[model samples]
Target: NLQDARIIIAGGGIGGAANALALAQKGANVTLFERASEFGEVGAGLQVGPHGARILDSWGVLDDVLSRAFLPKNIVFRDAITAEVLTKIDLGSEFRGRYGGPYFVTHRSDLHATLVDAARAAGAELHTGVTVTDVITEGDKAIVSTDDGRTHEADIALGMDGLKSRLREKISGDEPVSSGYAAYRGTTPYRDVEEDIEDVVGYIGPRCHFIQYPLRGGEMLNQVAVFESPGFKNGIENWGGPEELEQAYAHCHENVRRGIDYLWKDRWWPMYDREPIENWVDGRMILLGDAAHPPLQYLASGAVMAIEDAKCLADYAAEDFSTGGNSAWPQILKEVNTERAPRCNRILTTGRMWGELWHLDGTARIARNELFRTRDTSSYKYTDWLWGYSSDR
Candidate 1:
């Protein structure tokens, strides 16, 4: 029965693509549908924490990722005014030793391309320019309707479409809540950065913050800044929109303002997220990545969690639950949801809290910074649980 199961994955993003490949490699007939004409992405930068890297390592793309990605030696949290290093974590050595993989920072497009290639090479059927419109369930099978008025059926349907997925609404009515903060993201050649300021540095201040890191094999520096904006909508939501970077930086610090000039004015995106739901599946359909859980950007775990979802889903699909007869489907779905929901909540909530902590002002900002500077960085070691995990069969 497992061998006969035909899996249909909607949304060929990091999660869907990886899931397609993982499941197909495990002997499932998998088809992935992406709305885009080709598999590509446009985003400022993505922080590949140990958890993210571990998944890639297990998927056999870690070496390729490191070859193209900017593997930061350390992560420095600096004071907003003095620009003094408040805390430092040696990610390069610590990540590999503790989590079995190295941490990385890279452009979203590069990572996306790597995952897409891996999925295709593993023999998964991929379709582009195909938009999923609706879902229809019949017993253990489900059908996904596309925008062009065609229906594709499979033994199971996984929706990895993203935050505002149309298919997600069919399972739950909860929509993404705007975090009321917008970010401006862009890349500048590393050569353009002012001297004596190299490596990854997060310049923080009251109610505003900017992160700059070396990218493009350290030839370019990627920068992102988040500020309060009432009209700012999610930046990466639609991939294109009206950006008001000049207006957003009205009260930003001088050092940050100067660095922003290096960006040549990229677009501003308001981040949005939903409270974790009690369920990510309905009948034979399940949601993956941002569709199941959209995380606030502060933790930079958005893409990481999506990839985790792909690996975990594939592993669960490999289970031999068919011996239980016609009732095995629900049991398998339950196991799949059980594996992902709690972990998603923990990460989503942590990210939301981090976003709030970054935007604090007055005494609160000082207290927060003091705690961050004095706190044992190892106390925040959830990366071991999140990244060091392996669902691969």
Candidate 2:
């Protein structure tokens, strides 16, 4: 079984940490290498849907995470220029009962720390400040070389190193593609905001959208503003600057305008996601999370997908290792790819479409709002396919 297998993880981010913890709990020897000296995540926020929460609950970290995260009562969508509510989705006990888990809004750092703590507690070894230089699969084992001029060998290698992963090139040779959009995110004390907000709010207007939610048990307000940049038309290199951000939201509603003022202006993030591929496995090496699929933020499933990937990868490995021995590695990975690739690819395409819908202008914008307004409480049924999912499938 995997109880004696040695695994090398190339990143210590949320996905890597979750995978390490999952495998370690199964009695596998898990070692994770991170280039960063300390374990952390960006100072922003993320939404964890029930599909992801189910995995965390299975891992025994859901209670701790819930204690630190905020469970919003609802998800609201509004017009960015008028602050008029167009649609609202209930997220109360009924919603939770329907999905079998609660939806959570949490600070990215808190979630990262929670995963890191669980991984370490599960007996996984984490090595920091060690950058992976290259990975090559050789005769039933994978060899990982690092910047420190040392090499490590393991029965299998997992590339959770993120978008610029060196291992990704060896597997698919596909590069990251920009989305022509940029985001500015920041967190402020809840009391600092002019309005009190306990639910997730989304404001959509022509070419832009803003999301605001509570974090850390409603003590902090996290805001993310994303907009199509005129500067992007000129060149991606010169887009997403402070001046562009201001111009993009200059005519937005006062609430949105004020929210933008709180964003970190020193830097903004350029959005990128790769086109989906048919495979995520190569010989003794496999890819997980962003290394396999990076969805646009519009879906809000980026982190959740990574978390789901960890659970699926660990489950498949443990099952095959127990029943078929090392010879089952290829079939195991093929099973993971077969199950995850289609869902991830659909999310990627839908995220792009969702963003486009949010950024529609003129006639399209009015039609969109009318369509949203017509979606009543019964509309929750439409999302059953997404939130009702279980990784066991």
Candidate 3:
């Protein structure tokens, strides 16, 4: 039975921690390794759609997440230059009822902490400040080597090491591709913002977009400003700087420009994503989270996708253990790749398309706004494929 199976998870981020907890709850021995000295997330805010929320609910941490998150009244899309609302999607109980789960937006650290706490409570062993250097797979087992000159063996090794994953190299040779865009993100006190900062808002414009939402139970507001960079087209090292950010929003509406003024100028994030790969398994070693699929934040499903992977991995593994014992692992891994790769690919491509739509120019921008303006405000048709998903299918 899986009760005695040794499962080693590389990386202790959201995906790694959630996977550790999921497997541990199924009576497996899970050991998670994190390179960081402490448990945390580097980003500011994350949006968890219902599909992801369902899995977290199954993991028994949904209540904890909801306690720390802000449930927005609606998600509003606006024209950046005109400051006019293009479309709005209500996110109240009706929206939640349609999906059978709640949509959540919270600080990244809060989510990470909740998962970590749940993992510990589930009896999963967590090792921080431990870096996995290499993974060697034998016939039916995998061995993990660490930078501290230590080697550990496991019945299976799952890589959740993120986009810069070392384990990813052992499975696939592809490198992360830059998206020629950068994001400036920060959190400010609610009192610091003059606008109605309760609901999630997106201001879309030519080659740029801005997003704002409440976090920490309405105590803080998280904002992100993203823009396509001409410098990145010339060279990666010379991507967008502070001046470019200012210039991009100089012509935006007063509300958008005022919001941009709150962004952190000292640092910005260069966006990168890899083409979806069909294979994420090599022997008993498999990939999860950004190690497998890294989608752009255009859809805000990056973290949710990782969380969903953890759920799928645990569910499939437990199913296999119930019937075929450990011998079914390779086939189980194959099934996971088959089931998840296409959905992840869809999100990757669709997110890119959505971003393009948000940053259109000239005639295309006019056409886009016209289309949005005419859409039924209460309709969730455009997002049904995304938010209406349930993993049980």
Sequence-dependent TM-score of model 1: 0.90
Q: How much is 299 displaced in model 2, in angstroms?
A: 1.1
Q: In candidate 2, what are the lDDT values of residues 255-362, reduced to their tens digit?
A: 999898888888888899999887888888888889989878887888888888888888988888898877777788789888889888888888889899999999
Q: For model 1, which pairs clash?
A: 51-387, 233-270, 234-270, 235-269
Ranked candidates, highest lDDT first: 2, 3, 1
Model 3 lDDT, full chain set: 0.87
For candidate 1, give the lDDT of residue 302: 83
Instruction: Write out the backbone clash pairs for model 2.
Output: none
Report the lDDT tens digits of candidate 1 across residue range 1-393: 256667889999877877886777676778888999988887557888887787788878889888888878787887666666778777756557877777788888888888888777877889999988877788778888888988888877898889888888887887778777767777877787664444677877766678988885678888887766645444444432335444555556566777767653435566788988868888888888899998888777888888888777766666654455334656676787888888888888888887777777789978977888887776546356666665554
101-205 per-residue lDDT for model 3 (tens digits): 888798888899999999999889999999988888887788889889999988889988998887888767889898888999979888888757678899999
Roughly what TM-score does model 3 have, to 2 decimal places? Answer: 0.97
Which pairs of residues clash in candidate 3, taking residues 3 or more apart in a chain or in different chains? none
Candidate closer to the true structure by TM-score (higher is better), 1 or 2: 2
TM-score of each model, in listed order: 0.90, 0.97, 0.97
